[PDB]
Design a protein around this ligand. Structure first.
Ligand SMILES: CC(C)=CCC/C(C)=C/CC/C(C)=C/CC/C(C)=C/CC/C(C)=C/CC/C(C)=C/CC/C(C)=C/CC1=C(C)C(=O)c2ccccc2C1=O
Ligand SMILES: CC(C)=CCC/C(C)=C/CC/C(C)=C/CC/C(C)=C/CC/C(C)=C/CC/C(C)=C/CC/C(C)=C/CC1=C(C)C(=O)c2ccccc2C1=O
Ligand code: HEM
Ligand code: HEM
Ligand code: HEM
Ligand code: HEM
Ligand SMILES: CCCCCCCCCCCCO[C@@H]1O[C@H](CO)[C@@H](O[C@H]2O[C@H](CO)[C@@H](O)[C@H](O)[C@H]2O)[C@H](O)[C@H]1O
Ligand SMILES: CCCCCCCCCCCCO[C@@H]1O[C@H](CO)[C@@H](O[C@H]2O[C@H](CO)[C@@H](O)[C@H](O)[C@H]2O)[C@H](O)[C@H]1O
Ligand code: SF4
Ligand code: F3S
Ligand code: FES
Lengths: 257, 239, 239
């Protein structure tokens, strides 16, 4: 397999970037995309060039650190998988493929393909939790949770925080991430006592961080690696409407350190 | 603590305001097309409908009271829709200016897998705004795009809306503009009828396909009727 | 997963379908009797009511617009009622065929302590079905039960329903058929008006006697109102 790559190359935040082309003559069809990037980096270091920088920790599709925009589709052309899971047996000999970071105002670009995703952490910090301190927990089987509710909560809770939903929608909205967290915490009884405040706070924080609105387009669900469905956004909308009917006011925003 | 006004503060609250306003506006559009279908019945029935709009419960509700209430509600809804649209569009435009190759291109390559709703919705909204202004100025008042000595204002209790319509869609430019606006409004409804149900949260796995079908049928009906009117007027089917 | 159509799968869902359909049909029966009460006023008022049915919201809706919608809803409800009734009757017949003395009996001796509702409802339902078939073919269309040159079809915008009524109930057989059908429908309502509330689950200790009394009064009112007509026409008190 002979593969032509068009990699986004940016030195830092202030320095503008551009596309650069690299040709790889020999490619093993069954090695993953990130391993191809590793071989390319090794070749660049051997030649005397600056290696391509990208995020990767687990290479299993669970940690959520890997983040690439390949051929215009987040996490590669195949769906329901992350960038680390994308093996390039799904590409074609002689193909020309372009790789870019996420593009958003809330995800500043730090290097060639590395972005700053701390806005998700700040969204979580503003209410995305259950305020229970250590040692005060009751017995495990005190509160029953139906199997269906627990299953839906687990479906919403399996979000790896990759940020591909933000890079999918044109509006640059974090609605899928916020909705998934709100749905996960709102389907269990332990999340009841502060849910109507929680959603409002979280939504406000997203507006504070620079994300756009949701036009209900639906790119995020088609890109999301964990098949998080649009019912999470409907649940968030129901919760926010109910909170507005109660006169719940958002708290002060979480300012970064 | 302010109450239901809290929807003004957040983006989702503006979206909810927009959804309720869209409910009202979709209802008005459907009812208006249904009422305008009467021009095929004849000038007598059309003028009777136009007169009876003002005399809506005339013995009990007075003259033009209900029509003025409906007009006020429609104006309030339209203004709220415009305000929320402009605010949300500016906010979503700010989310892309920092990280983009150019001011006209976000990614060097981006392939969409769920439609082009944003472009269609926003451009159709602007076009619909301009069309509403021109249509009100052109058929309700008859002061623009109309030959002199051809508009008959309501003189007392007699209405000549059939004459105004049959003499309105005669310039090909006007009928082309109307057809363009109606295409964009068809796309607008085709997305928004489902989008407003999703925004209020009245959606799940069971009802998604049903709501999509309802949106499709509503948009198709409105488009067919509202393009049948001026084309028929221009070609001479309605004389 | 499919949603509300899950009511088709179980027997209780079919009973719920019957309950909603019975709500609609009871409403129609009461309204229809109330409307037919007007023929004691005279031919002018009766013909005015018949004409005004076809003209509801004259300057808003079209000619026979609401009437056709109501007709479609009534047809849909009646068809659902018939389908559910047939299905459940066949099921309950199956439940009582393996173990039973003879074939038209179930117990060597059996003494009911809560009324003969099943026989009444089923036989009255069959009779009401046949009666509706005859009634639409008798007064709405006028092709049976008439000496030639006695039924005046609606010509243009005039109605002669008073003439058709006074020329309809002259055969003693027809008025007797109407007598029998109205008796059976009285029993049908006397049970169903309470059964619907019990089936939908809106019944407590407090409301049981209230709902039974409401069923009694509705059945008696409908019976008296709908039996006063053929006797009056046959005896000549309405001419
Ligand atoms: C909903 C959407 C899509 C848009 C909202 C647009 C709306 C609600 C526009 C309102 C239109 C409007 C102001 C209608 C009122 C029409 C007016 C003011 C007519 C004026 C007017 C009146 C009221 C007469 O009685 C009369 C009697 C004899 C001669 C002339 C006239 C005359 O010109
Ligand atoms: C049983 C229950 C509760 C409900 C089901 C019963 C229903 C809804 C029956 C439908 C009855 C029905 C089809 C009524 C419409 C009557 C019709 C079709 C009349 C036909 C008819 C029409 C419509 C005219 O306009 C006309 C004009 C001038 C001369 C003659 C006619 C004429 O014969
Ligand atoms: C080509 C099809 C259309 C025709 C022929 C048409 C015709 C008319 C006419 C004749 C009136 C005046 C009513 C009267 O004098 O009694 C009117 C009013 C109006 N039309 Fe339309 N219309 C059309 C499409 C639309 C559409 C698509 C919209 C929505 C944007 C619209 C919005 C209005 C509004 C807002 C009014 C004023 C209502 C009021 O003030 O009470 N029209 N139209
Ligand atoms: C003919 C009258 C109109 C109707 C019936 C209508 C209907 C709708 C509906 C139902 C929605 C979805 C609401 C939601 O999901 O929350 C919507 C969205 C939208 N409409 Fe309209 N609309 C109309 C006119 C306009 C106008 C005049 C504009 C702007 C000038 C506009 C701009 C928009 C925009 C921008 C959105 C999407 C908001 C976003 O960015 O997320 N529309 N419309
Ligand atoms: C005049 C119009 C009719 C009305 C207002 C009416 C009303 C009702 C009502 C209210 C019920 C009880 C609903 C429930 O408990 O869920 C019922 C049950 C029933 N109706 Fe009707 N009905 C009508 C015509 C008919 C017809 C035409 C048939 C059959 C040909 C029929 C056969 C039955 C049967 C068999 C049941 C009970 C079956 C069961 O419990 O499984 N009815 N009806
Ligand atoms: C003996 C009492 C009754 C009288 C005097 C009576 C009178 C009439 C008359 C004159 C018509 C023909 C006019 C028309 O088509 O609307 C009619 C039609 C009709 N009647 Fe009756 N009726 C009686 C009993 C009933 C009852 C109890 C029902 C309810 C099940 C019923 C259901 C209908 C229906 C469905 C139509 C056809 C209406 C339409 O769709 O056009 N009738 N009735
Ligand atoms: C025809 C009448 C309508 C046309 C005229 C009105 C449209 C012109 C206004 C353009 C937008 C300005 O509108 C203004 O937007 C800002 C920021 O977007 C909103 O600002 C508020 O909401 C946003 C998100 O929704 C958050 O940052 C925060 O909660 C707060 O700042 C204001 O609540 C709104 O008043
Ligand atoms: C005039 C209008 C049509 C008249 C009636 C024609 C149809 C006859 C209905 C009788 C057969 O009824 C048809 O089959 C069976 C019952 O037998 C129902 O089927 C259902 O039956 C019962 C529920 O009550 C369940 O045990 C079964 O699993 C389910 O399939 C169908 O949903 C019904 O449509
Ligand atoms: S919602 Fe999906 S796409 Fe968005 S961060 Fe979570 S896992 Fe990634
Ligand atoms: S694709 Fe974008 S517009 Fe909303 S529904 Fe998902 S964040
Ligand atoms: S590197 Fe952990 S999800 Fe890909």
């Amino acid at each position: 397999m002979k593969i032509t790559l068009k990699i986004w190359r940016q030195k830092n935040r202030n320095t503008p970037g551009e596309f650069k082309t690299y040709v790889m003559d020999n490619v093993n069809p069954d090695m993953s995309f990130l391993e191809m990037l590793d071989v390319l980096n090794e070749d660049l270091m051997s030649r005397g060039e600056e290696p391509v920088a990208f995020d990767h920790d687990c290479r299993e599709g669970i940690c959520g650190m890997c983040s690439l925009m390949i051929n215009g589709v987040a996490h590669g052309p195949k769906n329901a998988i992350t960038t680390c899971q994308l093996h390039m047996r799904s590409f074609k000999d002689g193909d020309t493929i372009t790789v870019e970071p996420w593009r958003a105002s809330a995800f500043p670009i730090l290097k060639d393909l590395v972005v700053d995703r701390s806005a998700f952490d700040r969204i979580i910090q503003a209410g995305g939790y259950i305020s229970v301190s250590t040692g005060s927990a009751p017995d495990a089987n005190t509160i029953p949770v139906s199997k269906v509710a627990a299953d839906r909560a687990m479906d919403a809770a399996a979000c790896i925080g990759c940020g591909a939903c933000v890079a999918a929608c044109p509006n640059g909205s974090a609605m899928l991430f916020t909705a998934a967290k709100v749905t996960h915490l709102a389907l269990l009884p332990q999340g009841q006592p502060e849910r109507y405040q929680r959603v409002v706070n979280m939504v406000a924080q997203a507006d504070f961080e620079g994300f756009g609105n949701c036009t209900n387009i639906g790119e995020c669900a088609a890109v999301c690696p964990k098949e998080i469905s649009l019912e999470t956004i409907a649940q968030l909308n129901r919760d926010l409407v109910m909170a507005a009917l109660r006169g719940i006011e958002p708290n002060t925003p979480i300012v970064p350190a | 603590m302010t109450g239901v006004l809290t929807l003004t503060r957040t983006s989702v609250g503006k979206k909810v305001i927009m959804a309720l306003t869209g409910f009202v506006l979709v209802g008005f559009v459907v009812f208006h097309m249904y009422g305008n279908l009467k021009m095929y019945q004849g000038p007598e029935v059309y003028n009777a409908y136009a007169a009876g709009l003002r005399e809506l419960g005339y013995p009990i509700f007075g003259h033009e009271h209900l029509l003025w209430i409906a007009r006020f509600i429609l104006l309030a809804s339209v203004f709220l829709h415009i305000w929320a649209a402009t605010s949300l569009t500016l906010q979503s435009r700010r989310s892309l200016q920092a990280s983009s190759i150019s001011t006209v291109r976000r990614y060097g390559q981006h392939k969409r897998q769920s439609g082009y709703a944003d472009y269609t919705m926003r451009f159709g909204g602007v076009l619909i705004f301009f069309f509403i202004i021109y249509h009100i100025l052109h058929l309700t008042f008859g002061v623009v795009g109309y030959e002199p000595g051809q508009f008959i204002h309501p003189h007392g209790d007699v209405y000549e809306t059939y004459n105004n319509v049959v003499y309105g869609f005669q310039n090909p430019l006007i009928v082309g503009f109307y057809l363009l606006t109606m295409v964009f409004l068809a796309l607008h409804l085709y997305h928004g009828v489902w989008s407003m149900f999703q925004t209020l949260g009245w959606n799940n796995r069971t009802y998604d396909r049903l709501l999509r079908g309802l949106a499709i049928v509503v948009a198709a009906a409105v488009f067919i009727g509202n393009i049948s009117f001026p084309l028929a007027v221009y070609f001479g089917f309605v004389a």
